[PDB]
C-alpha cells in the first residue's frame, strides 16, 4: 500500500483518464490492491472505463489478477456488459476459462445477464461452454432457467 497506489485505485474507478496518465508517468503501482483485492484494472473493468483499461495493460498491469474470492477483471467486464473492455482483456491474454472460488466463469456471468455479443466473443477465444460451477450448472443451464430464447440458441453448439 503506497500513496500513489491508493490515488490510482481512486482515479481508475472515477474514470479520470488525465489523472491516470499523470500517475502512469510518476510510476504509480498498477498492482495496487484494496482490502477486497481489486486492482485499478478490476475497478476500471467494473465501472466500464475502456481508455484506462488500455492504459493500465500498456503499463504492465496483471490482466489475470484475482480478488480474495477469485474474481478477475474479465469476470466483471463480462458480467456488466462491457463488450469493448472484454475484447481488449482477451486480446491482452485474459484467461477466458478463469474460475472464481464458486467455480463461476466469465461465460456463466455473461450468459446470466443475457450479454449475447460478449458470449460470442468469449466462445470465439475458446470459452469452455461445458464448464460447470460448484452446483454443476453450465451457461446453457442458466439460459433455459432465465428462459433466454436467443442465448439458448447460441450455446446450443
Amino acid at each position: 500500500g503506497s500513496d500513489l497506489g491508493k490515488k490510482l485505485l481512486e482515479a481508475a474507478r472515477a474514470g479520470r483518464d488525465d489523472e491516470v496518465r499523470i500517475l502512469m508517468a510518476n510510476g504509480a503501482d498498477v498492482n495496487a490492491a484494496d482490502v477486497v483485492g481489486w486492482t485499478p484494472l478490476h475497478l476500471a473493468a467494473y465501472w466500464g472505463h475502456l481508455e484506462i483499461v488500455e492504459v493500465l495493460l500498456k503499463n504492465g498491469a496483471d490482466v489475470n489478477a484475482y480478488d480474495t474470492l477469485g474474481s478477475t477483471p474479465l469476470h466483471l467486464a463480462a458480467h456488466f456488459g462491457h463488450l469493448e473492455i472484454v475484447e481488449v482483456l482477451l486480446k491482452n491474454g485474459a484467461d477466458v476459462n478463469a474460475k472464481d472460488d464458486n467455480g463461476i466463469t466469465p461465460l456463466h456471468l455473461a450468459a446470466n445477464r443475457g450479454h449475447l455479443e460478449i458470449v460470442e466473443v468469449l466462445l470465439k477465444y475458446g470459452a469452455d461452454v461445458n464448464a460447470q460451477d460448484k452446483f454443476g450448472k453450465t451457461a446453457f443451464d442458466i439460459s433455459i432457467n432465465n428462459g433466454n430464447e436467443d442465448l439458448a440458441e447460441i450455446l446450443q453448439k
Partner: protein, 240 residues
Amino acid sequence: TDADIAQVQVQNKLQLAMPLLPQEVQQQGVSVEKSSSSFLMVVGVINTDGTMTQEDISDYVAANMKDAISRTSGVGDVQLFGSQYAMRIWMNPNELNKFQLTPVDVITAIKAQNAQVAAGQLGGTPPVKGQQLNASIIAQTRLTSTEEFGKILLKVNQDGSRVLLRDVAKIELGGENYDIIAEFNGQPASGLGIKLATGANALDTAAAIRAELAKMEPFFPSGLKIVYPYDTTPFVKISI
C-alpha cells in the same frame, strides 16, 4: 369544529379498532381524511403519440405524479382514475394440479424467493482486534421483473426436473385492480380526482397543484400531456 382536532380524536379511537381488523384490511392501508366530498378539479393525462395504453398512463400518474399532489397542502383526498401496476401472478388450476401444488405453495414461494434480507456486515461491531475489512453483506433482494418472478422455483420433481412459477401461472405487470377505466374525449386517459381539504382555500390549492404539475412536465415520456377536463376554480377567479 377544528378539522385537525376532529381527525386526531377520530384516529385515536380507530387505532383501538386497528388491531381487531383482519390482517388483509390492515395491509391495504386504512386512511383517515378531512376533505370536501365534491371534486375541486380533475387532472387528466393522455398520450397524443398513442405510445402508452390506458393501463401504462395510469401506472405513470400513480408512480411519478400522484404522491407529490397528495402531499401538497390543501389536498384532502386524491382519487387515481385507474390503477398503479403490481406483479400479477395469474395462476392456472390445470397446471397447479398437474404438479400437485396450490395457491398456498405459490404464496409461500414468492415470500421466500422475493425477500429483502438484512444479513449484517463483515467486520461488524463489536469487532475483533486487528480487523481491516468492513463490508455490508447483501443476500436476497426484492425481484424487479416478470422474468425474475417467472424463474421462482416452486419444487424439484423426483426425476430432478424443476417446476418454476411461469410453469403454473402467466406473469405480467398489471394494475393492482381493474375497476377504474377513464377516457378523455373518447381516446384513452388516466388522471387524479382532487378533493379540497376542510377549510383550505380553493384558488390557493389549485395554484399549488399547477406549480407541482409544472415541475413534472419536463420529465414526462414522449406523447404524455396534461389536460384540464374539470376545474371549479376558474369560475371563482373569473366571476370575482
